[PDB]
Amino acid sequence: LKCNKLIPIASKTCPAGKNLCYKMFMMSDLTIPVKRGCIDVCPKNSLLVKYVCCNTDRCN
Known part of the structure; x- marks a missing residue:
């Protein structure tokens, strides 16, 4: 998945x-x-990020 x-x-x-x-x-x-990009679960968001996400190839 990319x-x-x-x-x-x-x-x-x-x-x-x-x-x-x-x-x-x-x-x-x-x-x-x-x-x-690509990930399993929206990660541990640091001081510079807040990750959004959706389950299949090119869904973002």
Whole structure:
């Protein structure tokens, strides 16, 4: 599972059973994300992130 980055037309498949197409939003300004990629569960969000996510190839 890889999915799309900030742009609508992006990538296809990255490692393991990480189903969620992440939407890595900035903790300080959410709306337009930092990155858009691949993950199992929306991760442990640090001072610079608040991750959004959806279960299949290119769903973000």
